[PDB]
RNA sequence: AGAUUCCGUUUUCAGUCGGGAAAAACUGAA
């Protein structure tokens, strides 16, 4: 049933010409099978014989199917794709089940064979030719060319989606009550209707497709509440996702390795991190698609960690477009936060963890905000509006912090929830110098060549330390120096640098850091009682400064 | 009409920008806005085979009634051939800077008449997103000068000129500067008598800079001069020299000579008494080096001042401030820094359009992520300046 | 003397560090 829809005009990448590749002669058996097969696709109209003129060619493969005299033959389109007009994939991502509203009547029509039904542009078909040597040895070869969206071809999906939509459009202007969501060969048709009248609409629809060659098999959804639209079991109040099985065969074939990627990657928009990125490196050195090729501990171990995650299933409620969205975040530890977006107390949509630390020195107040903004858009994508928050931070703690911060910030539907681990600015610096605090003039330095330096200070009283240092930068000394003066001082202390670097880090009220010295410097800061860090122009004869200046010089 | 041929800049292809996620609402909004334009035939659906894309969004205008389609043409504009043959908005007034009152009009809707060069339409492709990605996006292609395009106005330059000429020669002294989709109509007439002229100008089409002021840097007014009070002053005047090479701290540093506790008070002697007062003078005397060079970009830097206040400086070359200022949006409840910073951004670019005739390129004191998730919520302009996110150092103090 | 800034992805995601003052990395998965 080759659809009558107009064909999307495909081009090759400018500067390139179609593929030309040799076919490794297959076994007598394999060949006799590919023919057997090709002959009916030729019959169905899917492909067609062509003369040995057509310069271009792409390889064919596929072994015994384990059931009588047939084979499963899938073609290597790598080249053709490498030279094909890259299209414009028109979607921000895959749809999340939680995004679906609750409908009364829902059916999932799996449009079958949908690719072979949708016709390929004439002027590009040339490029899709393939042959069939198989003839044991005195082999010449059979020669075909597709007439419809090929299986592996790069266009297929993007062209198929465009076709599918042009076709639904009509039936859609006609049935505004009905909601059709497509995602590959699956048509989620929902409508808040009387199971009777729905049945009827589904009939109608099912026939429209037919008038366009799109045949919808009877082996559909007709009863089961757990419809599998995109692997999301769609019960009437609970969508779920059956744990993804991930095998590990003997003959770990290349394409297998590729498709494997798919499953992982698909789940990934639910299942937190799985990217078999280092297995992907095995694909960074491609060869015959039929060849087997394993990898080290990289490969072996990656699958496992993925599995662990893949084991525990997931699920949530649908999106009542009349009940509020509520996000709730909790500081479940250092640099890792958790959050849940729900609508009904124990009936949440998406839960989530958010490990991050955007900076070398951040603050909990700061990270909370990051987590907020992540969640904000994340909703705007899925639900279409920004949720209301319940955050582990007191309204006054925020208010002080933004006022005490050089950058502009903002949280939306902020609302305090006294949870156990709470967020607070661990310390704060003094706005004005402490009266009666020993004033520490600090400075450090280091020779670029040797990468050694000293760090010390002088004071309004008389104390005067200095320290030898190995393998550091002048920043590291300027920090060491602040540290010292912090150690060798009391609960209240005025300290003074010839360095905006260290000043800055500290000014930002860093909760933690990648920098141990900074952490050290922080530990002290939380322990002291009043600190006032000031800054003076290096090299000016500023008192006390010129002094520590000389002390650290060699 | 016969379309004016425009072409991308040498060796650059059309834009290919991904669309940002839109709220189930702005989407709906767009969707209707487009279905109409489609009916009016100003746009037209296109396929997946047009590899190009510019993002769109729903701004929402003036006293806020409805919705507006906003295409972030910034890229297609960077890739569009400059306009200089068909001199885009001919000489910049320069009068504008001075008039008692400039008013901006949205001449933009005119553009929808003139047909766009066919071999260029592909480059305006835009895509309306779908929730949960339950639907392929709706894709379109302009068939007329689009709203935010650089090409538009210059092409329509002549039609406009013929249109205003009468009214311009009719009122020989009301400056009219066209910038993008706007019409900056400046005059010095009394407010009431100004408005009429606008209305006269308005029928035709239907067919307050003079108060702006710069920031004079000043040192504090003290007597309680502690050591760091002086250290402070010293540091600033040091940096201030980079701007005014005449300012010099030395007699001040001399007061500081020792290892004095920061809290120690210190006697401001004539050494310094001379220097402060003398310096105070020069902080108000023009940095003769200022020059607005039409070939250099304007850069704007904004610092957060905590009291719902912000400071900004527009400059082409560092330390050569073409202008400096301070927006203080007292938002007792409307305290969305993001909303503020935004309003800051919008108010600074209009100032520059009216003066240099260009929107500065901003260095925003905020995290991309943040700026990226809320900006649209407050944006009210027909346009969108370029922006770079940054981390402000001690300038907050250095000028507040 | 030292110290800033921006960029490298540009429909998104999966994997890490360096240069320059308009100037410069890929594959795979969606």
Curated annotation (Swiss-Prot), chain B:
Short motif Tryptophan repeat motif, span: 371-387
Record note on what altering residue 106 to S does: 5- to 12-fold decrease in affinity for dTTP substrates. Strongly decreased RNA-directed DNA polymerase activity. Slightly decreased DNA-directed DNA polymerase activity. No effect on RNase H activity
Result when mutating residue 237 to S: 17% loss of polymerase activity. 30% loss of RNase H activity
Consequence when changing residue 61 to R: 10-fold decreased sensitivity to ddATP and ddCTP inhibitors
Outcome of substituting residue 168 to R: In strain: Isolate PV22
Outcome of substituting residue 183 to V: 22% loss of DNA-directed DNA polymerase activity. No loss of RNA-directed DNA polymerase activity
Result when mutating residue 185 to M: 27% increase of DNA-directed DNA polymerase activity. 10% loss of RNA-directed DNA polymerase activity
Impact upon substituting residue 152 to G: Complete loss of polymerase activity. No loss of RNase H activity
Disulfide bonds: none
Impact after mutating residue 180 to L: 90% loss of polymerase activity. No loss of RNase H activity
Outcome following mutation: residue 106 to A: 5- to 12-fold decrease in affinity for dTTP substrates. Strongly decreased RNA-directed and DNA-directed DNA polymerase activities. No effect on RNase H activity. Loss of pyrophosphorolysis (reverse of the polymerase reaction)
Site for Essential for RT p66/p51 heterodimerization, residues: 374, 387
Outcome of substituting residue 235 to A: Complete loss of polymerase activity. 25% loss of RNase H activity
Result of changing residue 152 to T: Complete loss of polymerase activity. No loss of RNase H activity
Coiled-coil regions listed in the entry: none
Limits of the Reverse transcriptase domain: 40-207
Outcome, altering residue 239 to T: Complete loss of polymerase activity. 87% loss of RNase H activity
Effect the entry attributes to changing residue 163 to A: 71% loss of DNA-directed DNA polymerase activity. 61% loss of RNA-directed DNA polymerase activity
Identification of the protein by name: p51 RT
Organism name: Human immunodeficiency virus type 1 group M subtype B (isolate BH10)
Residues of the whole record sequence present: 604 to 1026 of 1447
